[PDB]
Symmetry: C3
Subunit: 283 residues, 3 copies
């Protein structure tokens, strides 16, 4: 897909057009549509402005990067993403992450919506990602497929420690501060390609494999971030409880997902800000 130069050009373009120098990249999933509003000294770039950036044909906008400070933390926020189910190859899906690395970002925060597989979870819960199961990865759909560039990382990176232990500990503490009724969940996120929702039998399979939440994103980004050495922290908003029996007349649907994203908007906004304080300083 892209050459090392391509990534470098894209980073140079951004670096030369802003004085912001982000430590943390945040990929906004459902419910963080409005997180930019909490940025101070915001500066926007549209994907159409940025060289080599792929573009969503999705009607509203191409999407944007927004630099700024979140609780005095120097960050870049990514709004609008690319998904495997939309037809994008994985090197396009994960293009931004390699760019962030070249911006000198050292921490990636990924968020998403997911269906709850774990019976304890409730719509509205936040689940810290402790680990993932990369089903597309097993079959070949891994973003690192192809020639490896030692300037980014190793030919065979490890994923057993992908989700930073310390940030999860600190996240667990600091969540008490918000004084929420439901606690912070923690669990395994499984990635499926989508875009259709799971059958009952499929949900049962995912449960047996050990997954607590299922979604259609995030994992490829995590793998690329880890490949180039970034610290990674992630979580899912449980937006619906996956159907697990044939009796129910309920069905997963996207409007439900958006509604859940709205209810949780503030909780999520609050939580990401707080979390900024927990992030270690550069080096």
């Amino acid at each position: 897909g892209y050459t090392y130069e391509d990534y470098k050009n894209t980073a140079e373009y951004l670096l030369s057009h802003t004085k912001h120098r982000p430590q943390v990249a945040i990929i906004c999933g459902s419910g963080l549509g409005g997180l930019t509003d909490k940025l101070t000294q915001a500066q926007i770039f549209d994907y159409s402005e940025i060289p080599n950036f792929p573009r969503s044909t999705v009607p509203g906008h191409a999407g944007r990067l927004v630099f700024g400070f979140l609780n005095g933390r120097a960050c870049v926020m990514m709004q609008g993403r690319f998904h495997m189910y939309e037809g994008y190859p994985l090197y396009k899906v994960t293009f931004p992450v390699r760019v962030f690395h070249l911006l000198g970002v050292d921490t990636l925060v990924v968020t998403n919506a997911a269906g709850g597989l774990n019976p304890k979870f409730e719509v509205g819960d936040i689940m810290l990602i402790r680990d993932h199961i990369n089903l597309p990865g097993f079959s070949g759909q891994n973003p690192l497929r192809g020639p490896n560039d030692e300037r980014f990382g190793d030919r065979f990176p490890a994923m057993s420690d992908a989700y930073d232990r310390t940030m999860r500990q600190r996240a667990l503490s600091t969540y008490k501060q918000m004084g929420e009724q439901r606690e912070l969940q923690e669990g395994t996120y499984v990635m499926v390609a989508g875009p259709s929702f799971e059958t009952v039998a499929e949900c049962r399979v995912l449960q047996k494999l050990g997954a607590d939440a299922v979604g259609m994103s995030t994992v490829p980004e995590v793998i690329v971030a880890r490949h180039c050495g970034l610290r990674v922290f992630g979580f899912s908003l449980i937006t619906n409880k996956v159907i697990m029996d044939y009796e129910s007349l309920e069905k997963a649907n996207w409007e439900e997902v958006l509604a859940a994203g709205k209810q949780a908007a503030q909780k999520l906004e609050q939580f990401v800000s707080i979390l900024m304080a927990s992030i270690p300083l550069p080096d």
Copy 2:
């Protein structure tokens, strides 16, 4: 792959060249090679005649759509299909289904051959598909991958109710009429890409995941049908019992599959006809 126009053209061609107006599409799998013979007022179209239709290089024929009445039921029958293992992309495999929708069909009946994973199953059994596990789908091989057309259906369709409850109830009753020794089985169908047959370890994996039968087709069609609102009903002829241990010297083989398809031909022909009576009338 195709544009909305393409589908529309193909449907218009067919609609303008026949007065038949099918309610039910039937995709014939093994053992239904001769089901066209029970059609009254038959009218054939070869795939070579039909605009935008993909074509099998398989030597005998391109294959054909045959309109007609089966037990006075207005239907179109599809003979010869396209498979993922043959190299076809999924939007080609499932092209006919979208066309059937545009013909005003509202019920899809899919049939196939499958290996028996459930120890209770016997060669010759018919298994009603209650649900499926779409393994290729997990990895990205989903026919709906790419831009969604809202003229067909939603961006994120649900599959939890894919196989019509009522049809299955009615099918279970009406099977008594044939007075068969072995009863109607019901279970989960798993799709694997093929074309090689499962190892023992793989068979055990598919059993653990909860599958009763394994095949190499059908699921992409079902997903597309449901996406555009069709009622779906399906079943598998158990043509062989998958090897489950290292002692056996038996091996799956395609001649065995064809033989089973032949033994069952009449039972199957009978069953599909009967079933026509059970189908609801056009809403």
Copy 3:
């Protein structure tokens, strides 16, 4: 990808440029032994020389086929392979296997490195592959995908008997001779695409599915070999034990893998030679 001609040309080129006529092809695992040194009457071909052969951009060399005798057994050895994770399509990954068949080879020995999923395995163990779980295969990534050529094999080949039971029984049988403290393991190999290593959750998934060892190669080759009638035998050097819990601070890494491949080099070299004696005659 390739036509039947292409395969034939490549075979004709090789046949016409050597008098060696191998019975056994051996694919030396990426991470494993430089066993060519034990070949007598060696004759090398570089991949660059051979028509239609794909080529590794990997800096050191394209890689080579080396004909010869190993314990008086007429064989061809393949050093350097192609992997799905490198971007190669499967028909390129398995191209050599089809060519071996056309050379008149009738037995394929495949070896590789693998991470240990079964708690009983120890770094250094050899695991005979009794069976495999082809995960990419389930999703479409099967090397036989596309039109079938009946000149090679059936449209729907069976894999339930892929790994020759006699060769395994003999291997385990004569292993006594390998006067090792530790014995010959036997198990299920699972293929995953790679190139990144498994998480803990994935490890547990693969364990539940019944796999004993996990790797990123071999299976496509085996599928192609069996499609054209070859006898297949295969084994894995357990080069590391896959991380199974969140507490550990160990991580899989490729240097560990190369180290283990080094410690085991002689044990492996010895074992393959011995095995030559066990192979049936044409």
